[PDB]
Amino acid sequence: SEKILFTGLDNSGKTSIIKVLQKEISQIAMLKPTRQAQRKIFEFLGNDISEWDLGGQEKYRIAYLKEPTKYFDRSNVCIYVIDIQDRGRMEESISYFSDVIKEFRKLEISPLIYIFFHKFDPTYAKNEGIHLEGLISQLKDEIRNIIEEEFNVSYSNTTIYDLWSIISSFSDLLLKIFPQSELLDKTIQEFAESLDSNCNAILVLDSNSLVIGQFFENEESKQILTKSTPYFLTLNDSLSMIIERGNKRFFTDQFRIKRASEPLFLIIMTPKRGEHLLREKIDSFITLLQGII
Amino acid sequence: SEKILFTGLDNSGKTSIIKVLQKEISQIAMLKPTRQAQRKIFEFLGNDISEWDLGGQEKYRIAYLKEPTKYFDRSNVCIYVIDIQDRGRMEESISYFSDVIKEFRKLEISPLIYIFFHKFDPTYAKNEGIHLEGLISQLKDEIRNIIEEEFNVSYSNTTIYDLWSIISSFSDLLLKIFPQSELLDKTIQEFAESLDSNCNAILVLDSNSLVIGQFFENEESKQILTKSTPYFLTLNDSLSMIIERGNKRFFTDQFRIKRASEPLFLIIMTPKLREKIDSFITLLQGII
Amino acid sequence: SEKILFTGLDNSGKTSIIKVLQKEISQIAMLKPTRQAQRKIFEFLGNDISEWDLGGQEKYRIAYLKEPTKYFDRSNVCIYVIDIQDRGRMEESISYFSDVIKEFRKLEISPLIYIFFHKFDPTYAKNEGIHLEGLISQLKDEIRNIIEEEFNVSYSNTTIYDLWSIISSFSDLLLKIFPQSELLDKTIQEFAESCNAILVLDSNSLVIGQFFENEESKQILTKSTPYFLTLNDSLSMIIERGNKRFFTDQFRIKRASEPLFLIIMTPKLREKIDSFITLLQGII
Amino acid sequence: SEKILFTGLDNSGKTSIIKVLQKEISQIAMLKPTRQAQRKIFEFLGNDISEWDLGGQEKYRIAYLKEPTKYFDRSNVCIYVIDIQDRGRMEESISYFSDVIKEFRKLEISPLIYIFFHKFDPTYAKNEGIHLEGLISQLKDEIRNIIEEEFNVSYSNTTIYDLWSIISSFSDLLLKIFPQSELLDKTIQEFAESLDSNCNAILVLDSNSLVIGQFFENEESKQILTKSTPYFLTLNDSLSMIIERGNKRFFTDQFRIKRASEPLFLIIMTPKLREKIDSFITLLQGII
Amino acid sequence: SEKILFTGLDNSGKTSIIKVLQKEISQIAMLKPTRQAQRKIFEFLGNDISEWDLGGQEKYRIAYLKEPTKYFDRSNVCIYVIDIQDRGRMEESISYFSDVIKEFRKLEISPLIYIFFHKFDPTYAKNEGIHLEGLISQLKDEIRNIIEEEFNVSYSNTTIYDLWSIISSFSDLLLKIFPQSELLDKTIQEFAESLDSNCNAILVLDSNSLVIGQFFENEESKQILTKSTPYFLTLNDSLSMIIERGNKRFFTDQFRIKRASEPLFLIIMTPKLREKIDSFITLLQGII
Ligand SMILES: Nc1nc2c(ncn2[C@@H]2O[C@H](COP(=O)(O)OP(=O)(O)OP(=O)(O)O)[C@@H](O)[C@H]2O)c(=O)[nH]1
Ligand SMILES: Nc1nc2c(ncn2[C@@H]2O[C@H](COP(=O)(O)OP(=O)(O)OP(=O)(O)O)[C@@H](O)[C@H]2O)c(=O)[nH]1
Ligand SMILES: Nc1nc2c(ncn2[C@@H]2O[C@H](COP(=O)(O)OP(=O)(O)OP(=O)(O)O)[C@@H](O)[C@H]2O)c(=O)[nH]1
Ligand SMILES: Nc1nc2c(ncn2[C@@H]2O[C@H](COP(=O)(O)OP(=O)(O)OP(=O)(O)O)[C@@H](O)[C@H]2O)c(=O)[nH]1
Ligand SMILES: Nc1nc2c(ncn2[C@@H]2O[C@H](COP(=O)(O)OP(=O)(O)OP(=O)(O)O)[C@@H](O)[C@H]2O)c(=O)[nH]1
Ligand SMILES: [Mg+2]
Ligand SMILES: [Mg+2]
Ligand SMILES: [Mg+2]
Ligand SMILES: [Mg+2]
Ligand SMILES: [Mg+2]
């Protein structure tokens, strides 16, 4: 299987990120500090994945460093969550990150390192401007000096007030473990162009609502589709569909692949003024996706 | 202002019904016994209505009867909620119903009485069958002997597992307080027939999602629209729309009327013209 | 009957504050933008109080200013909520505050104005420090220029991450509407002298009386009382945890429907508590 | 590792039971039908245990039986949940239970079979009485004819309206996977007797609030401590202790054992000595 | 021989009903709780019948269910008596009834079940109204669910304040064991119409004063004769007769049938011929 480890200081936001990934946002208010490690198992495209949420209180971080084989071993990815709104605890956070990397070195493993600069809220980021960007740049410099190019590192700005920032970062991480064929993007890109200027955006999602494939004509089309899709997903699950809302038309479809348990979800967005997508075009597209993914 | 009173024994389901009406079903798992009377104010078509939820524990029921002018006076509608799954407490429920009716008599007021035979769940109703039907018929006989034709009494079977049963019963109650013109049903019927064989069902809702007008070509069209509308409303609120799914097409629209604060909601289901809709809405704005 | 009006821009936090007051914190994650005016009624010491939660989205603010008599009239207290983390919307917030004050002037009423500097979170205040205090000073100066000594104005810092900040501020507001006798504080002050802390709460868990020997005792009792309440309501009592001892009691007053709650924290006498309760029942 | 499997028909209540075990009762109102298998990992006295929640809708049960090695294999316990309020689906429930037992036989494994007669609510049980008792007796006969003494079977009446019904059954189930020494029951018994007539009830809980040991002088002392302890825990967790309410006094304590990660919880109820509690704790640390 | 079983909870009124049948109403005030089973033998139309009065206190009921073959075996009729004034013991009563039926199932016998809804006093029934009727209808449903159409069940409302209610129910019970020829009712009907409109009511009784045949022109004629007959019997016993009183005339006669030990009693009420009577007696002698 695969092991994904969430770690970081207490209050950094690890459990809230997980609650977003589980579509259980309503449980974020009732969140208490996580006690030791909480573990669950989920499936990504036919592969079972174990997820570890390490409670970040100091009494728990010490226990993690006392029995490192129990917690840090066999990790394929380490998600390290930093509360970028809490400058006063950043030095402490980098210090605990150095301890975690040191444990990986003693175990002689090199998991993918994914840093979530978390609580990067829209309101907070707008009011803080380049002052916040400079702080993140200093954080990366400290992280690079600790990593010393012995680990692969990725960085993402995340916030529970932007579901896409969490979904796409977690999807990008899973697709680094399970790389996709270049044919996938080439097929999606060619399908969009075969519609002749009548395709603003496409998403291919799995049963966890994680992103398997994507296309965006521009930044505005990306914002419209990624912000509307969760509500269309809620509608689909509660009830193929065609939805006209505002100046856009949405085509939604479910399809299965051989190796995965549950169906995948396809959504295509076009201008409302555009021609209706021919069903035979969507079906041939789905047939290729079933052979590529 | 109009006064609507929720009363009945504890555990009968009054607050859960209100939570359904407030679109807050998720809080039903968190419900505690209601402490005495809880009150809110909402608007229905430009009229304010105060809503009283009276906690049903015995210590509160005694307080209600000790100071009747503070709780039962000026009530325009009394909703009496009966847990029809609790046979063992029905005699106590009817007994307390007699007390409430007596206080109305002493105050010399005649509010509309609306019985909610509540917790009429689909699974429960299917397993209990004619026994539950006979048990409800016996409850009605006891209520009739208490009322003695001195009050207008309506009945409905309700359950939180059927949102339509609660929404349409409460809408029916409010439309008895505020009667509609006969032109409304005629306009909805005439608009439906003007679509040839291409109009299965219509719903006109207010901002509380209460039913102001309705049309159903048959029972199957009624089931499809009433079960699907709550999810379209959640989508519309979370974001004019058109939704095609299966063999049906759904048109949703919002329009305002002069006397009401928030817009109304129109949804039309057809098998799979903006002018017909715009002209329909214009007629509704002059009638509703 | 008294009318309390919650207003301010959308996203400022008004409904979350109300949810804390209703002991419904678990619903804050499920909150959506409030549509128009949501109204409820509750009792405070035998008095009925109507509470108005005005949705702050611009389309609703335009409707409030189009029909001022329907929303702002007969207001006894206006609670104006400002997201002090959102400097980018502060000019917009002060401008709408000016419009609200103007409607009060045209109605010729003078409600108590209670400003909540909301989202004053412990982490945010720790990191912003003195820069945030200067910002609050600028807001007070603007509000002063708008009020022009025609309204009584009070200020409070609030955050859903400090339940006491919201409970005490709202209690302080209600005690300005319904003033208490000075004998209440003196009776509590003298009972303790006869004690690290004392709270007298009503059935809404609002603060009717309080005593705190020092800042440390205050933090201990204020943070512990909700769970002592949760224990009580869900279930007199005597509790010992740590180096402290707690005494909880319930009693009724003549004009109130539900009982009041008394909790005393001492370092670790029935007759002295019963005489203290007797005096409270004759003063509150 | 150990594997616990929740299965049964859709709507039987499996996920609600798990929500109670996870101290997330507030989320029961938000539950949706479970899609295929949901899996979590928890610790019981130092042992990692995988928990499988198999969604019960028919399209999922067909998938389970198509690939029985992926779902039923290596199971230590099978919890089969039956909605005993839904007589109309009991024949369907027993038939799927027989299919599950058949898959265990083809795998040549013998998990403990634990039947939960769920939704045994206080109100429903009181109103149905002996009529429901006879129906449960008929269910046991069908289960026994399916088992044919090839499996170990346990039965429990459960309901989300009685938290102890679910906690104690799940605790009883875990203690059969990990049998305890007879010294634990004797030690708890002797300590309660060393207090003379000053010990009404004792509970020893783990960090999951599952029951490791228990003592009850009589049925009334059992109902007082079990219904009070969740609020004594929520107090302690959200915040040693002594509490006096009514005619009772309570002592709470936390202690750790060598092989477990988180502390255990001890609570003693007496009618209204620190050295005696410490020595009793020291004994438990060498026995558990 | 035939076996009739009187059973039911203590205080239900079993022994009081038997005292009415034995013409010993004066002993009702001296009744104590019956200790275990009391047994008598009486003759009905040439057939010996054993009558078991089972004491209903719980310690006796437990003794019955411990040795079911001694008490319940070979029963031809089980009379179950329910005090319908005591709602607080109806669950206990229905539960014990379920136990008795379970013993008949294990014995693989199917006696006639006769339910006496007892203490249906005129004053109590008048004051309780349809509330008592619903309760009896509820009890009837519980009995049906317990029986599952495996037994013949009859019902009657009985009370010691209406001798006819007890006499006619016990008579109807015995005639179900020993069905009569259809020529009997046709003969009584034909004799009545042969007297023109000069025949309001007829009773044919045995030496136990049980009703072998009856005829009533209307309800008033039934109430007059059924209420006057007990005193006519006492006069006849204490001493053929003719009695004129008010606007009615009563003819009484005694006759024997070949298979019965003691004479039968014929009473005819007419508005105010020996030969007609003698021939009517002759037909009855060969039909009964
Ligand atoms: N503004 C903002 N707040 C957030 C965000 N994410 C989480 N929070 C809040 O931050 C607090 C910390 O959340 P948690 O998820 O419990 O943090 P944690 O890392 O799991 O803490 P531990 O359980 O001790 O490990 C919670 O009150 C969240 O509501 C975010 O993206 N933006
Ligand atoms: N099966 C079923 N249960 C229901 C239904 N409605 C409410 N309940 C449950 O019945 C219980 C009673 O809920 P409440 O709404 O608090 O009852 P109440 O009348 O408000 O009781 P008081 O607050 O004491 O007056 C709750 O546990 C609900 O979940 C229903 O329609 N069907
Ligand atoms: N950090 C922080 N966030 C808060 C606080 N209070 C509320 N929020 C968040 O701010 C957002 C706005 O909350 P609301 O209470 O709905 O704001 P509102 O004033 O009611 O907005 P309208 O309904 O449009 O009038 C929500 O996401 C809350 O979670 C707080 O004290 N601190
Ligand atoms: N009255 C009563 N209702 C219950 C009880 N437990 C669960 N329910 C209700 O039963 C319904 C089914 O609950 P679930 O837990 O989702 O059932 P499930 O077995 O998980 O169904 P699937 O996800 O399809 O497998 C929900 O509406 C619950 O509220 C109970 O103990 N008593
Ligand atoms: N009002 C009223 N009381 C009755 C009636 N029949 C019996 N009772 C009273 O009910 C009480 C019970 O009478 P029993 O005949 O001794 O009852 P039982 O079933 O024989 O009791 P056990 O001997 O213990 O089995 C007596 O006090 C009677 O006076 C009736 O028809 N109406
Ligand atoms: Mg956490
Ligand atoms: Mg309630
Ligand atoms: Mg709001
Ligand atoms: Mg489920
Ligand atoms: Mg007797």
Chain A closest CA to B133's CA: distance in Å?
31
**DSSP summary character for residue C180:** P
CB C139 within 8 A of CB C94: yes
Residue A208's closest CA among A159, A260, A259, A158?
A260
Q: Put residue A226 in one of left, alpha, beta given phi > 0 → left and psi -120 to 50 → alpha.
A: alpha
CB C220 within 8 A of CB C268: no
Residues A53, A57, A58, A59, Cα dihedral to 10°: -90
Which of E5, E11, E64 best tests ligand 5's pocket when mutated (most atoms within 8 Å of CB)?
E11
Ligand in closest contact with the CA of A12: 1
Exposure string for D36-67, b = 16+ CB within 10 A, e = fewer: bbbbbbbbbbeeebbbbbbbbeeebbebbeee
Give CA–CA dist D270/D200, Å, rounded.
5
Q: Count H helices and E strands in chain E, helices first.
A: 10, 11
Give CA–CA dist D58/D36, Å, rounded.
10
Helices C58-66, C90-107: axis angle to 10 degrees equals: 20
> How many A from CA of B55 to the centre of ligand 2?
11
- Compute CA distances D2 → A41, D75, D213, whole Å: 14, 7, 21
Residues D181, D184, D189, D194, Cα dihedral to 10°: 130
Give CA–CA dist E9/E90, Å, rounded.
9
Instruction: Judge residue E155's burial from the number of C-beta atoms within 10 Å of its C-beta, 0-12 exposed, 13-18 middle, 19 or more buried.
Output: middle
In the numeric block, the tokens 């998720």 are attached to B26
> How many A from CA of B71 to the centre of ligand 8?
30
Contact assignment for E94 to D134 by CB distance below 8 Å = no
Residues with CB under 6 A from ligand 2: B 8, 10-16, 28, 31, 33-34, 55-57, 118-119, 121, 159-161
- Which experimental technique did the depositors report for determining this structure? X-ray
Size of interface A-C (CB pairs under 8 A): 36
Give the DSSP letter string of B180-193: PPHHHHHHHHHHHH
Tell me if there are at least 3 CB pairs under 8 Å linking chains B and C.
yes
> How many CB atoms are located within 10 Å of the residue C227 CB?
16
Give me A152's structure tokens: 């692969």
**DSSP summary character for residue B262:** S
Give CA–CA dist D104/D89, Å, rounded.
23
Helices assigned H by DSSP within B24-162: 58-66, 68-71, 90-107, 122-128, 130-147
Q: What is the 3-state secondary structure (H, E, C) of C232-276?
A: HHHCCEEEEECCEEEEEEEECCCCCCCCEEEEEEEECCHHHHHHH
Residue B264's closest CA among B211, B227, B216?
B211
Residues in C whose CB is inside 8 Å of some CB of B read: 24, 26-27, 30, 32, 35-36, 39-42, 50, 63, 203, 257-258
Q: Which chain A residue has the Cα nearest residue B248?
A: A241
Ligand in closest contact with the CA of C10: 3
A61 in contact with ligand 1, CB cutoff 6 A:
no
Report which secondary-structure segment, H or E, holds C197.
Answer: strand C197-201
> How many A from CA of A227 to the centre of ligand 2?
36
Contact assignment for A85 to C123 by CB distance below 8 Å = yes
Give CA–CA dist B155/B117, Å, rounded.
7
Handedness of CA B137, B142, B146, B149 (dihedral sign): positive
Q: Which chain E residue has the Cα nearest residue B138?
A: E134
CB C263 within 8 A of CB C225: yes
Strands in B201-205's sheet, in edge-to-edge order, are: A211-216, A201-205, A264-271, A248-255, A241-245, B241-245, B248-255, B264-271, B201-205, B211-216
Report which secondary-structure segment, H or E, holds D249.
Answer: strand D248-255
Closest residue by CA, ligand 4 atom 7: D13
Query: Nearest by CB to B245, which of A26, A231, A241?
Result: A241
Give CA–CA dist B248/D188, Å, rounded.
67
Resolution (A): 2.2
Give CA–CA dist A3/B109, Å, rounded.
70
Give CA–CA dist A50/A177, Å, rounded.
13
Residues B33, B39, B43, B48, Cα dihedral to 10°: 150
> How many A from CA of A29 to the centre of ligand 8?
16
Q: What is the 3-state secondary structure (H, E, C) of E35-89?
A: CCEEEEEEEECCEEEEEEEECCCHHHHHHHHHCHHHHCCCCCEEEEEEECCCHHH
Helices assigned H by DSSP within chain A: 14-21, 58-66, 68-71, 90-106, 122-147, 163-177, 182-193, 219-238, 279-292
Which of A6, A15, A16, A158 best tests ligand 1's pocket when mutated (most atoms within 8 Å of CB)?
A16
Radius of gyration of chain C (CA): 20
In the numeric block, the tokens 């009173």 are attached to B5
Contact assignment for C63 to B261 by CB distance below 8 Å = yes
Closest residue by CA, ligand 1 atom 7: A13
Give CA–CA dist A171/A154, Å, rounded.
13
Which amino acid is residue D59, in one-letter code?
Answer: K
Question: What are residue D115's DSSP bridge partners?
Answer: D80, D155
Residues of chain C contacting D250 with CB distance shorter than 8 Å: none
Nearest-atom number in ligand 4 for the CA of D16 is 15
Residues D123, D125, D128, D129, Cα dihedral to 10°: -130
- Residue D160's Cβ-side half-sphere holds a number of Cα atoms within 13 Å equal to 22
Give CA–CA dist B178/B210, Å, rounded.
13
Nearest-atom number in ligand 1 for the CA of A31 is 16
> How many CB atoms are located within 10 Å of the residue A97 CB?
23
What is residue A165's three-state secondary structure?
A: helix
Q: Contacts for A141-145 with beta carbons within 8 Å, 24 or more apart?
A: A142/A94, A143/A94, A143/A97, A143/A115
Chain B closest CA to D249's CA: distance in Å?
26
In the numeric block, the tokens 């023109």 are attached to E196
Contact assignment for B87 to D123 by CB distance below 8 Å = no
- Compute CA distances D103 → D73, D79, D107, D151, whole Å: 9, 15, 6, 13
